[PDB]
Amino acid sequence: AYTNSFTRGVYYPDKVFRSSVLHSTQDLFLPFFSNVTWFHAIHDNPVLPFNDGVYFASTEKSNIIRGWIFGTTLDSKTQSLLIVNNATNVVIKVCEFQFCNDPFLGVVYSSANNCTFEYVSQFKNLREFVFKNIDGYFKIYSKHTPINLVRDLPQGFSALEPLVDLPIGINITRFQTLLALHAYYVGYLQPRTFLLKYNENGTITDAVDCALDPLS
């Protein structure tokens, strides 16, 4: 399935406060009017290559899509990332895990050999997620509030502010989404340059593509 992402996928690139200045940046971004592979896995979790950063979304205001496992082999040979939720805290384990055929999670665990690191942190709703991993830093954004004005399709303009970054220093090329036992979008991002407009409060109010149209 194909869906048209109008203008989603804009985030604060750095941590520097600006005001009423037009800043032209060259970073990894999701192009405007892109095509995203809408999934309808309701009675389906295929293997999705990471390709150096993926967009994400969701619409269900419940706990069905729980964890996002990352790695390159999904085997005990190499350490694999596992980031899951518990409805009260978020737990991240990078230790070596074996293969899982149909893991079930909801409020699997094969082995914990060669365990090194751990992390613990704290119309329907929208949860726009953007992941990136460069030079050993894996960092994640979030936006847990939608706008209740129009039903269907993720249209509207809003910014993304980062929450967490981990200096894992490992390589990831594939990832799986973990469900429970009984409609999320996916998009690919590549480094195209943008122009951003800042408000007097340091809030992104407009973004314009730089390599889309001659007027742009």
Partner: protein
């Protein structure tokens, strides 16, 4: 200073520029955040028990912040000598990872922990590689090992001809029987246990007392840094020209309170072209401002060395409160103090003029200053520019004024028309009769002809200019 910058012994009336001044920074402030991730090295040195020399334990330690100065000054260590690692500067070193090797040895086995050394345990149990290792620390443990320790709890491997590679452990205990010809020509005999027990007694001497030994090895430039040493900090000072490493990144200027608002996650800010203007400290989580310290050029106003010997100093774009700070009160000559304070600090729109009194009259002047004011030498007085005379003509509905007499005046007007037709030789300027210079210049393209063409063009242009400005008539009249 005016005579120096002009390189002459006579100075004509006017304003001149000599130098510039800056506000010297006073002190420095260092600000690091509250939190400091402490690392549990207490369980390493002060562990209840250690393993044997042939089966020492290894643990993985990373993402730690531990200070090496807190242990260097401790007197509970027999000796602290390291190979190529500075004990003092370890506080300012970041390492990719750290490896600890803790065990217990005999008194005479301390010297065996060194690269390129020969010994039973140095070559049979633990071998130091032929590269850089952090260092070894050893201390006495006769209180908990020589009196209450196990009589055979400590074992060493007396196995020869099996020199182990560095960082290798072989805890496999097997009976050492060859089972072939090269052992008394028989199979079964000559069986010696690979392990042997230490012989120790309570206070039996110096070479037999067990000592706790921990070898710390450090890896550098193999991975992103994870372990680093803590550093000190201090408080803050406001409203002074200060240089700082405030919250990491450095900067110099004066600190003021700010009314701007920051998002709950955003570190600092800027305005234009990488110019920091607002930083907040983790200790207070309060927004502040940065303002560059004032500076600027000076100027000297003089009425001419011939007429007098007194001058007036002007600082550009400086407020009164920094005038005593503009030039140090007690660093220059006492003659600069007559033109430093007191005198007359006439603060105007274009800085501060000191050394000349202020009068509330107004006359035509000759030495411009700016912002509508100018100074003149009657001492030296600075006043406001005068536009000239002032009169009002009595315009009426039916009145005219007709002149009755006339005068004839003669005026002069000077106009330049030409300059000197000069020229510079092309290669003689940069070569001076050297073949190497010409050889190297031939590789720089045709700069010579390009430079020589312009001067000839200018000369011909000047000749044509003079010819057209003077030659107008075709004859000569007498």
């Amino acid at each position: 200073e005016t005579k120096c910058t002009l390189k002459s012994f006579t100075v004509e009336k006017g304003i001149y520029q000599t130098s510039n001044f800056r506000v010297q920074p006073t002190e420095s402030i260092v600000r690091f955040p509250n939190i400091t991730n402490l690392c549990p090295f207490g369980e390493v040195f002060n562990a209840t028990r250690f393993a044997s020399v042939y089966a020492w334990n290894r643990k993985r330690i990373s993402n730690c912040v531990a200070d090496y100065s807190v242990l260097y000054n401790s007197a509970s260590f027999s000796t602290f000598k390291c190979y190529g690692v500075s004990p003092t500067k370890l506080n300012d070193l970041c390492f990719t990872n750290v490896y600890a090797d803790s065990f217990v040895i005999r008194g005479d086995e301390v010297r065996q922990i060194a690269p390129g050394q020969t010994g039973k345990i140095a070559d049979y149990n633990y071998k130091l590689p032929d590269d850089f290792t952090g260092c070894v620390i050893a201390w006495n443990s006769n209180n908990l090992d020589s009196k209450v320790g196990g009589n055979y709890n400590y074992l060493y491997r007396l196995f020869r001809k099996s020199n182990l590679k560095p960082f290798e452990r072989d805890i496999s205990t097997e009976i050492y029987q060859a089972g072939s010809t090269p052992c008394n020509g028989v199979e079964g005999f000559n069986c010696y246990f690979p392990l042997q027990s230490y012989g120790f007694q309570p206070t039996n001497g110096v070479g037999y007392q067990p000592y706790r030994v921990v070898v710390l090895s450090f890896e550098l430039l193999h991975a992103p840094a994870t372990v680093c040493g803590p550093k000190k900090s201090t408080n803050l000072v406001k409203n002074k020209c200060v240089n700082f490493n405030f919250n990491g990144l450095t900067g110099t200027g004066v600190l003021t309170e700010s009314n701007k608002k920051f998002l709950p996650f955003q570190q600092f800010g800027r305005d234009i072209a990488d110019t920091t203007d607002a930083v907040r400290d983790p200790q207070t989580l309060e927004i502040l401002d940065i303002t560059p310290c004032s500076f600027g050029g000076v100027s000297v106003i003089t009425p001419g060395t011939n007429t007098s010997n007194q001058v007036a100093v002007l600082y550009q774009g400086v407020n009164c409160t920094e005038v005593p700070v503009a030039i140090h009160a007690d660093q220059l000559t006492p003659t600069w103090r007559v033109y430093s304070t007191g005198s007359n600090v006439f603060q105007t729109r274009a800085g501060c003029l000191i050394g000349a009194e202020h009068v509330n009259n107004s006359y035509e002047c000759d030495i411009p200053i700016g912002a509508g004011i100018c100074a003149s030498y009657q001492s030296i007085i600075a006043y406001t520019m005068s536009l000239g005379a002032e009169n009002s003509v009595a315009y009426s509905n039916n009145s005219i004024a007709i002149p009755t007499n006339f005068t004839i005046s003669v005026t002069t007007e000077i106009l330049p028309v030409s300059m000197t037709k000069t020229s510079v030789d092309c290669t003689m300027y940069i070569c001076g009769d050297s073949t190497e210079c010409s050889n190297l210049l031939l590789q720089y393209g045709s700069f010579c002809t390009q430079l020589n063409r312009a001067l000839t063009g200018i000369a011909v242009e000047q000749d044509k200019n003079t010819q057209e400005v003077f030659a107008q008539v075709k004859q000569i009249y007498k």
